[PDB]
């Protein structure tokens, strides 16, 4: 049931000081802690993607590199998860994160992914309810190796930031939800990303996809949709973090961005 259905445009913007996360699982209070890790560099080139459905294959695949900073000001009901892997077919392992209104469900299987994968909602007359279908995400799922269901992390103006790292087998997800007063979507200041979910995956990931929810029309088989999301890339790089008296990373300096920063 794979159709090439979603188009996408891209622009370029500035990361400012976003993408900071807690590097470990240790409380620190009123200290200046220097750590070298996969961080999003300050004031970097971050791609703004507008994914459009109106009622050909125009949704190209992004490389994963060393890790992905993801951001979205759009609400949690249309954007509903991510896809990770290398070839996205039955020959290799594939990882799928799907959020819905009750929980979040994660697979590592061999998915035979479609070229333009999307979760589509439709009403079932036997169940008499609006149910979700993954038949446009993939055609099959066999030899499945991992499954994990937890409380969701896409809930409800609200900027949602995520950091995905793939280090020595573990897929680490960091997240933050920040109420952003009407203005520039990527705001100034610091919002440190708390370590959310560390998944025991152990697969090769060099390419990724982001998963959209599409609604049937019941009035051009799908309702028209729009999504805006920012993608940046992490680098192995040294930060200096300021921990306040409550243990929150409130400020940081990236060492290579400026000579003065390096002096700091």
């Amino acid at each position, epitope marked *: 049931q794979c159709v090439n259905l979603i188009t996408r445009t891209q622009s370029y913007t500035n990361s400012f000081t976003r993408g900071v996360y807690y590097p470990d699982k240790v409380f620190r209070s009123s200290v200046l802690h220097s750590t070298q890790d996969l961080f999003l560099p300050f004031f970097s080139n971050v791609t703004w993607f507008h994914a459009i459905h109106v009622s050909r294959f125009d949704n190209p695949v992004l490389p994963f590199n060393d890790g992905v900073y993801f951001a979205s000001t759009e609400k949690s009901n249309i954007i509903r998860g991510w896809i990770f892997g290398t070839t996205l077919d039955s020959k290799t392992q594939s990882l799928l994160i799907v959020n819905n209104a009750t929980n979040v469900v994660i697979k590592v299987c061999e998915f035979q992914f479609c070229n333009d994968p999307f979760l589509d*909602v*439709y*009403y*079932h*007359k*036997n169940n*008499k309810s*609006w149910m979700e279908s993954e038949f446009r995400v993939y055609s099959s799922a066999n030899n499945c190796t991992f499954e994990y269901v937890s409380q969701p992390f896409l809930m409800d103006k609200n900027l949602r930031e995520f950091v995905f790292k793939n280090i020595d087998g573990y897929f680490k997800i960091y997240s933050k939800h920040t109420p952003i007063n009407l203005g520039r979507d990527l705001p100034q200041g610091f919002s440190a990303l708390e370590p959310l979910v560390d998944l025991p995956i152990g697969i090769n990931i060099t390419r990724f996809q982001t998963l959209l929810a599409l*609604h*049937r029309s*019941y*009035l051009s*088989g799908w*309702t028209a949709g729009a999504a805006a999301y920012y993608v940046g890339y992490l680098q192995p790089r040294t930060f200096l973090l300021k921990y306040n008296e409550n243990g929150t990373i409130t400020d940081a300096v990236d060492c290579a961005l400026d000579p003065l920063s390096e002096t700091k």
Partner: antibody
Amino acid sequence: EVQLVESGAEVKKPGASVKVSCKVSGYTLTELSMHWVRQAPGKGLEWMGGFDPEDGETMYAQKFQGRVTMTEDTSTDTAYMELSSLRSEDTAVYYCATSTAVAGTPDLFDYYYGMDVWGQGTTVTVSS
Amino acid sequence: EIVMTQSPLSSPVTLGQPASISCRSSQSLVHSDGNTYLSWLQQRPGQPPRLLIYKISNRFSGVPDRFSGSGAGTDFTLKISRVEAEDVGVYYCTQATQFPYTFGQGTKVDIK
């Protein structure tokens, strides 16, 4: 847009079941209320039966109960109809109709009734 | 069972003139959802009927603006502003509120 296709016309000796099919394309059948209508030559067209979104599943005519039975194959996305105890007046053109089960967005949706898209009729002939 | 009446049975209409068809129901077609459910269909010889109008006044896709619907309660009218050579055939009014679904006897419209 829902597209409806039909099976071939038939002639049968009275006293046997008739298998009449309607295949749905463009949409899957679980989003669609499915209905069936007869038309005699020289008479007004009246109803076999069809789906009910609420307070039951499938409803039939009062004079045609006990003879019409209705199956839906979700794998092949088909609707089959069986009708037994044929009569010499049953020489008629059979229409398969369909309509959307609901209308609106997932947050605000309302149940729909009606016969919007109609397919081509199949000629049911009862003779010697 | 809801019984309806169609009027007139045969209406000889000249080219271009509007024609009005009355559908009358013995029972009120108001539903618990609020919206009243009436559908008008047009059937050509050699052609299955297609949906001309659904819910009194709302237009189906591909239906031209030459057709109008009006009325409420138990009295409904379908008006054809321009009658052409493709308008010949039998018109039906049907209800979808109360089971069983019953259909009108049809109104035959021709040219001459």
